[PDB]
Amino acid sequence: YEHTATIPNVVGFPYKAHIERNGFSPMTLQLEVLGTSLEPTLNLEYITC
Amino acid sequence: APAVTNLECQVAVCTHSSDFGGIATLTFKTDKPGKCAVHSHSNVATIQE
């Protein structure tokens, strides 16, 4: 089965997504982000001492 | 023969699957239990057992 959603980016914020289909009970999900890094794509121009 | 009165139905799912895509539910009023037989007077759907 397929389903899409969008969650806001704030940390420590449990989001609920709802799934409905014919022939089954409805069901809810619980997505909750716990951390997020952002590494740039480096290259050392130089180094200084 | 046990008398059966006030016979109604309600619909649960009704999908178009090939085998048996729906479950009906029938309530009535009687006086003593026993054995009966069911049948559908149409060709749109067929009932089992």
Curated annotation (Swiss-Prot), chain A:
Membrane topology listed for this record:
Single-pass type I membrane protein
> What does the PTM comment of the record read?
N-glycosylated.
Query: Per its UniProt entry, which superkingdom is the organism in?
Result: Viruses
Localization of this protein? Virion membrane; Host cell membrane
Could you describe the subunit structure of this protein? Interacts with spike glycoprotein E2. The precursor of protein E3/E2 and E1 form a heterodimer shortly after synthesis. Processing of the precursor of protein E3/E2 into E2 and E3 results in a heterodimer of the spike glycoproteins E2 and E1. Spike at virion surface are constituted of a trimer of E2-E1 heterodimers. After target cell attachment and endocytosis, E1 change conformation to form homotrimers. Interacts with 6K protein. E1/E2 heterodimer interacts with host LDLR.
Briefly state the protein's biological role: Class II viral fusion protein. Fusion activity is inactive as long as E1 is bound to E2 in mature virion. After virus attachment to target cell via host MXRA8 and endocytosis, acidification of the endosome induce dissociation of E1/E2 heterodimer and concomitant trimerization of the E1 subunits. This E1 trimer is fusion active, and promotes release of viral nucleocapsid in cytoplasm after endosome and viral membrane fusion. Efficient fusion requires the presence of cholesterol and sphingolipid in the target membrane.
Give the protein's recorded name: Spike glycoprotein E1
Q: Which organism is it from?
A: Getah virus (GETV)
Upper lineage:
Viruses, Riboviria, Orthornavirae, Kitrinoviricota, Alsuviricetes
Task: List the range of the whole protein covered here.
Answer: 816 to 864 of 1253
